[PDB]
Amino acid sequence: DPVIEEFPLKISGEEESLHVFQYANRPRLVGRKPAEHPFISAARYKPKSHLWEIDIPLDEQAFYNKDKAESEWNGVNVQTLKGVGVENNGQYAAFVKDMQVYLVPIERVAQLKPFFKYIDDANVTRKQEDARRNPNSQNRLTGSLLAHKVADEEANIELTWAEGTFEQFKDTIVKEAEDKTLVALEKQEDYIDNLV
Amino acid sequence: LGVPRIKEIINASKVISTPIINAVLVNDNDERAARVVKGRVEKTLLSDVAFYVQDVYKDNLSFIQVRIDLGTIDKLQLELTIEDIAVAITRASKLKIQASDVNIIGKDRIAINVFPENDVFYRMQQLRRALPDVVVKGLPDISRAVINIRDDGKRELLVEGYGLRDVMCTDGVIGSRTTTNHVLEVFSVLGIEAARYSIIREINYTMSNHGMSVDPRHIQLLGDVMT
Amino acid sequence: FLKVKGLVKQHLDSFNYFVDTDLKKIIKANQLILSDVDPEFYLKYVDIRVGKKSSSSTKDYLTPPHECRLRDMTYSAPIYVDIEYTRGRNIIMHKDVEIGRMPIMLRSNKCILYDADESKMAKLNECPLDPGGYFIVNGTEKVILVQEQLSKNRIIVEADEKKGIVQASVTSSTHERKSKTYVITKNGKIYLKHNSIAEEIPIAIVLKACGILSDLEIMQLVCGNDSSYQDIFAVNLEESSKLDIYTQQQALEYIGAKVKTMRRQKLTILQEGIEAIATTVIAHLTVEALDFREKALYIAMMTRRVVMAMYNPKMIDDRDYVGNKRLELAGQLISLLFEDLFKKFNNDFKLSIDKVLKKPNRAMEYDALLSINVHSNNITSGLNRAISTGNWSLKRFKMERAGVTHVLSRLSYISALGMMTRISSQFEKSRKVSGPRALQPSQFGMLCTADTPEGEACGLVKNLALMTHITTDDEEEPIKKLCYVLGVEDITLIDSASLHLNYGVYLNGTLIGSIRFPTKFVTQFRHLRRTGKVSEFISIYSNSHQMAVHIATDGGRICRPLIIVSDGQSRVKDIHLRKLLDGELDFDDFLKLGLVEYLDVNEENDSYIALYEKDIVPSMTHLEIEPFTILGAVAGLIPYPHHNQSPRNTYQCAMGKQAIGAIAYNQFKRIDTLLYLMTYPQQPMVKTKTIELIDYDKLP
Amino acid sequence: VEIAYHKCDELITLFNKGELETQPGCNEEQTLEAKIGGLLSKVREEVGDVCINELDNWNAPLIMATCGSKGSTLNVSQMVAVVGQQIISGNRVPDGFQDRSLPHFPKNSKTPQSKGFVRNSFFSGLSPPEFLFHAISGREGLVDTA
Amino acid sequence: MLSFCPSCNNMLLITSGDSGVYTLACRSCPYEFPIEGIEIYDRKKLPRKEVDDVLGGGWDNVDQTKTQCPNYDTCGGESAYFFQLQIRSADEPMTTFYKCVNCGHRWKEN
Amino acid sequence: SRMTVGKMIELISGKAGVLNGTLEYGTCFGGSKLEDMSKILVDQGFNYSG
Amino acid sequence: RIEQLFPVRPVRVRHEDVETVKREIQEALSEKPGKEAAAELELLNADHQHILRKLKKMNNKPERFMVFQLPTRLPAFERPALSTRELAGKVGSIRVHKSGKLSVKIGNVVMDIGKGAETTFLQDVIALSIADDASSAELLGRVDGKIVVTPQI
DNA sequence: CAAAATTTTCGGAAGGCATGCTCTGTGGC
DNA sequence: ATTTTTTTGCCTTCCGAAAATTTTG
RNA sequence: GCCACAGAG
Ligand SMILES: CCC[C@@H](C)[C@H]1CC[C@H]2[C@@H]3[C@H](O)C[C@@H]4C[C@H](O)CC[C@]4(C)[C@H]3C[C@H](O)[C@]12C
Ligand SMILES: [Zn+2]
Ligand SMILES: [Zn+2]
């Protein structure tokens, strides 16, 4: 019942807007060791629709099938992953700084799944080229239709991808979470009284 | 039995519920003879006589390999061989296969080759999922077979199915004493005059099980009007 | 218990829940009215009340029920609606606008006979022992009978072995829309069919229409790590490749190309497919954004249940199970009728407004409310008709039910008591033994084991037990937040590959997330229920075969109170019983103290109930309050019924409603079409506790 | 009845362990059900036979059974002695709940009292589970007649 | 054959191609896996249920005979346990089951 | 043929109750026991079985 | 490195063994270098030990994150009452007892801790900036595990 | 020998029937 | 102009589609 | 008059 050691828990970063990516296809562990992180070449994020789009260049030397891509897919050599940032409440991304656990609120979590925009582009180009040879007050949209329309019309934002920024983030999080200590107010039973 | 049996007898029902063929064995006091006769009428699927079915792809040739076993065949004592399994595979018309493709490798292996923009993969997947459900021995309509020891101690072989002629033509089964509760089957095999006895006997048995005690002259009249 | 929750009061409760709460839901479903001509015109129903003005302190006068009986009138109270609209250029609001007359149930909170002493009953020529719970329409007293249906918003898995197919059906029922969806097996493949979709859609295509775009994700969600499920389901993965659909837009095109849904506005085929997936495929699950995870997981769970049914046919759901059946009372039926009536009223009012507004010769905008009454009577008329004729025809929901209401039988006191609390089965034409007509063991304590008629309706129409309660609908969002707090990882951030490695959580049949420790979660939720932090009619039960914990919140579930047993000791002690007999510590205090709790059939499945105190082993979970609950009100007249044969008890339940005796205290002030009275009635020499409890010895 | 219950419990133990011998045409569950049903029918017949031979002369149900005017030996045995096994559609009481008949019995219980055997006579009064099982059988008969 | 493309976790299919050589190809993304010199097989091990030897236990305490086993190139046993059984019609000869005592490999004749 | 022993128990319970002066109970899975009613009947000069 | 480009074969378990392999699979996914009540007690003790060693392992390791799952309404704290998103600084402590059990005390309420669902896929944390001068989204590390905190009731 | 006409076999859908026999009441259109 | 079902089984006739067989070149 | 349920054997 007595405690032998305690790890303090701190919360900081109320304006960081920290996201979490979740690749549906890329596994975490291969064999017994952590897998190599894929290299990201391009990132896009629609702000009002919270659509994330991540481009990963796949190897062309081994297992590429240059003929099919160069013929009917206009030579696509990258795989794109699309996801929607779902707002989840109560999720904190935490790290450790000398047995002190620092938590930063997570804004959205995105389920990135493979996207095949070149297939749709080829389909619509085929439809246009086969329809133009021989052809043969209205905004009441609400709900999912309006969301799809506003996601389609709004343009992507070419985000500048970067790596190795963790040290500055850790410094500002530790600095922001070291000056203040908050005193407890609610009783143990009063917390259980409402929203258990 | 009871009222549904009367209902399905008095009309010419081509298919009934629980049809039973009571074959009388030539040798009735040996369990081994009864079991080896049962092996000739009870259907045995490919899955009952095979270790594995697999699909193999090579540099330019694609096939399906089946490994049958001989220990199970020997212990159950089926009069079945490897070439019999091959010709039974070919006789399954729903698989769309012919004898030119089926080949024998070793004493256990059977290879079913496939030759031809994506048809070969679909056709081999269909063949792989349909192959272990073919019938290599037994009658195609017999659901199951059991060996019943009667009151006097002699054994009879009674089956669920619609192949009366194939049961009574099977060696080891006396064809002159094999009967069926189904009536149109008896009409097709033995004629109308045996169908009349089948109607009369089945209705009389159904009435006597419940102890209704009806005089069988009424039953004879009903059978004569039906036939 | 019979002083608070009762047996006849159940109907009352539903009507109360219809008047105080559910009318607001019906209004807010379709509260807004637009105009075709003028875009600035809008009408907004902001509130609704029955039999009370917002201005007057005292409720408005109503004719007494006996006066309505004598004069062939309708016992009813006006419906008052607060309406905001535009008259010219300024928004104006008007309260207490009458749009019809709701026929009120007797002895409800809107009746004149509510909580009235015997002297006031004598002043109004009404018997104090009248059960109430019926509607006086045109002088005739009609009872809206209890309807029995399959559980709504739940997956029901059934199979036809003689036809060889399996299916999983969901009957989505929500105030916005009602629909039915099927996931069926055909030719070894799995398809999804709906009334709006013209052709059956392969399950891979409809799963790709949602957020899932990987075949590995589909196969991992449907099957998981089990090899046999993968072998069964791998055929359906090839139909996505055969029909060259690989992206979400392609599947949406394919689905929307074959939708028969007529729409007022012309809509794009892609947008039609998005609408069909969002609102039509599964009606009670809606998506307001680009995320389709909940719908995808619902369809995947249905497909997994279908696959598990195909692997072995013993994993189907029993339609005759009481936990799979829900009971519609008068409140739910009047709600589902008033929804149609209000939709027709809104359509007619919008047509009238468009007709008047198309005339441009009027400089001054007119008052729309002046044209309420010329439509409003229709509501009342239709309402009265749906209780008078008993025919129940609603083309919006394709519902053609008949015999919903019945003329209240007045052959005896127990006859009128047993006409109340009567269940009408869904399958009225089932002539098969051991189907819906069998007495399921699941109805022990919920439905009467003896009260059923002899004849063509034997086993179909049935009566409630003595000590039962029928759950009313209540909000589920606090329960959802409590689930998220208690340790349930949300469905939008868990792995699709490892979803079947641990227990899932199903709120009202919808997969809300995953739980690492199911037993601790169930114990904590039961502790919160027994303490009083959540509603006592919320049901928690863990199904180990499906690896799920189900939380049921919606109404229509049959419940039954039971004494809790902990550590081999009954939680109800002698001091509690002494307090209850002395006058304090009533049944509600028993509920708050955690001594008794309500168990429905599904929670009774995950339980172990002791019949008597002497039979308690340490493994028991609950204790029976009293056994003769399993016999209903009509069956309670039989003395020593456990010494009899069951058909004798059934015949007594049939013939007790035809016995000649005293009807009510005002039987000589009543003018009924046929009334048999006995000159010298006597109370029985051999009584029953049920006889005393239902006051049968007062009017024998 | 105690001897029959002990033997039935022994068969349940053998079935649960897995060394239960099977009938020539039946599986484990089928042969267990057949053996238990035969044992319970035998014990009902034995108790009925020891009941009928003891009733004295000028016993009205016995006289009415001897005449054939009304009733039978089975009805007298059910009124005075054990009612017997309740049979629904040729089998015992089906599992209405998950892997059990009633919540008043443990899960995976196949004891005679948990699947439709009424120890009590009609004179001694039926317990609530026996009452429910007898109601199930009577309802099946009523529906069949209807 | 149940395999999935590692790039996009979509199902892999086998096509003939222009060269006539089969490859594991993905219809969604540009990925192929040639199988020249590589074996691929998806084995479906069918379940095996125990079967009782319907002729076992019958070669105990029976007369012997001098019949050479058909596997003469592997062994030269002569004494074999033999017995007679009628498994056919009554107008055709009653068959003989006989097993070698050294090599097993039981066989029958008419 | 109908086996209504509960009817005989009702008759004896009613007889003993009307001789004793109190209404009796035929409550399911309980009620007034037969031995008490036989004792009441035999104390009043009637046969125990009614 | 090209071994990852081999056609992935999904995990297949026989139907009779699917309920038994779940322990082995659940332990293999992490790959560290009442009968149901007792089983969950053992699982909770193992989870507590695993959380302790995983917390000790990632001390001061760059680009190493672990996702906490706290209740959406934290206990109220006195203003320097405060909104749930307005908390800053130290709020509580993770405590280890002699039995090896771990408990998270926030304010004045003690709560449990468990490692929750086991994910088989890769997760990383991405900061985001929507500055009009230059919009950037820098990677900060990978998520290694997840813990869940539930009230002690 | 294999292309083309003729015939047979085989499915799924479309129809139909059954869902007792009599008898006594009411209530609403 | 969004949108449930509300028994269960048995039987013959029709009618393309595909398979089987014969018949022309 | 047509439907609709309600009962009786
Ligand atoms: C998969 C099940 C098929 C089944 C319904 C088919 C396949 C075999 C068929 C029977 C045989 O043909 C022999 C008979 C022929 C007579 O003409 C009519 C009756 C007869 C008993 C047939 C009835 C029926 O047609 C059967 C049982
Ligand atoms: Zn791919
Ligand atoms: Zn040899």
PDB file of N, CA and C and ligand atoms in Angstrom, chain B residues 13-15 141 162 182 184-185 188, ligand 1:
ATOM      1  N   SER B  13     -46.251 -37.051 -54.461  1.00  0.00           N
ATOM      2  CA  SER B  13     -45.132 -36.205 -54.074  1.00  0.00           C
ATOM      3  C   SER B  13     -43.836 -36.824 -54.580  1.00  0.00           C
ATOM      4  N   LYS B  14     -43.167 -36.129 -55.502  1.00  0.00           N
ATOM      5  CA  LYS B  14     -41.931 -36.654 -56.071  1.00  0.00           C
ATOM      6  C   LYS B  14     -40.803 -36.651 -55.049  1.00  0.00           C
ATOM      7  N   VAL B  15     -40.795 -35.675 -54.146  1.00  0.00           N
ATOM      8  CA  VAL B  15     -39.799 -35.582 -53.087  1.00  0.00           C
ATOM      9  C   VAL B  15     -40.527 -35.557 -51.747  1.00  0.00           C
ATOM     10  N   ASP B 141     -27.280 -39.765 -54.474  1.00  0.00           N
ATOM     11  CA  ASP B 141     -28.471 -39.306 -53.775  1.00  0.00           C
ATOM     12  C   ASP B 141     -28.617 -39.864 -52.366  1.00  0.00           C
ATOM     13  N   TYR B 162     -32.641 -41.684 -52.553  1.00  0.00           N
ATOM     14  CA  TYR B 162     -33.624 -41.931 -53.598  1.00  0.00           C
ATOM     15  C   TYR B 162     -33.129 -42.885 -54.680  1.00  0.00           C
ATOM     16  N   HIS B 182     -40.821 -44.642 -49.949  1.00  0.00           N
ATOM     17  CA  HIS B 182     -41.224 -43.783 -51.053  1.00  0.00           C
ATOM     18  C   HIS B 182     -41.982 -44.593 -52.097  1.00  0.00           C
ATOM     19  N   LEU B 184     -43.410 -43.251 -55.381  1.00  0.00           N
ATOM     20  CA  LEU B 184     -43.139 -42.997 -56.793  1.00  0.00           C
ATOM     21  C   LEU B 184     -41.820 -43.619 -57.227  1.00  0.00           C
ATOM     22  N   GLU B 185     -40.871 -43.744 -56.302  1.00  0.00           N
ATOM     23  CA  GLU B 185     -39.630 -44.458 -56.576  1.00  0.00           C
ATOM     24  C   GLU B 185     -39.904 -45.928 -56.882  1.00  0.00           C
ATOM     25  N   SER B 188     -41.498 -46.165 -60.296  1.00  0.00           N
ATOM     26  CA  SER B 188     -40.546 -46.041 -61.395  1.00  0.00           C
ATOM     27  C   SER B 188     -39.703 -47.301 -61.547  1.00  0.00           C
TER      28      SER B 188
HETATM   29  C1  LIG K   1     -30.735 -32.667 -55.259  1.00  0.00           C
HETATM   30  C2  LIG K   1     -32.039 -33.438 -55.120  1.00  0.00           C
HETATM   31  C3  LIG K   1     -32.644 -33.885 -56.444  1.00  0.00           C
HETATM   32  C4  LIG K   1     -33.981 -34.587 -56.257  1.00  0.00           C
HETATM   33  C5  LIG K   1     -35.101 -33.645 -55.838  1.00  0.00           C
HETATM   34  C6  LIG K   1     -34.229 -35.508 -57.507  1.00  0.00           C
HETATM   35  C7  LIG K   1     -32.900 -36.224 -57.869  1.00  0.00           C
HETATM   36  C8  LIG K   1     -33.158 -37.686 -57.928  1.00  0.00           C
HETATM   37  C9  LIG K   1     -34.601 -37.607 -58.211  1.00  0.00           C
HETATM   38  C10 LIG K   1     -35.411 -38.855 -58.191  1.00  0.00           C
HETATM   39  C11 LIG K   1     -34.743 -39.770 -59.229  1.00  0.00           C
HETATM   40  O1  LIG K   1     -34.760 -38.997 -60.374  1.00  0.00           O
HETATM   41  C12 LIG K   1     -35.615 -41.093 -59.346  1.00  0.00           C
HETATM   42  C13 LIG K   1     -37.187 -40.884 -59.505  1.00  0.00           C
HETATM   43  C14 LIG K   1     -37.674 -40.419 -60.899  1.00  0.00           C
HETATM   44  C15 LIG K   1     -39.218 -40.228 -61.073  1.00  0.00           C
HETATM   45  O2  LIG K   1     -39.470 -39.727 -62.352  1.00  0.00           O
HETATM   46  C16 LIG K   1     -39.782 -39.242 -60.028  1.00  0.00           C
HETATM   47  C17 LIG K   1     -39.383 -39.660 -58.609  1.00  0.00           C
HETATM   48  C18 LIG K   1     -37.842 -39.972 -58.426  1.00  0.00           C
HETATM   49  C19 LIG K   1     -37.889 -40.699 -57.059  1.00  0.00           C
HETATM   50  C20 LIG K   1     -36.913 -38.666 -58.503  1.00  0.00           C
HETATM   51  C21 LIG K   1     -37.502 -37.554 -57.652  1.00  0.00           C
HETATM   52  C22 LIG K   1     -36.640 -36.341 -57.641  1.00  0.00           C
HETATM   53  O3  LIG K   1     -36.733 -35.724 -58.885  1.00  0.00           O
HETATM   54  C23 LIG K   1     -35.211 -36.648 -57.224  1.00  0.00           C
HETATM   55  C24 LIG K   1     -35.019 -37.414 -55.899  1.00  0.00           C
END
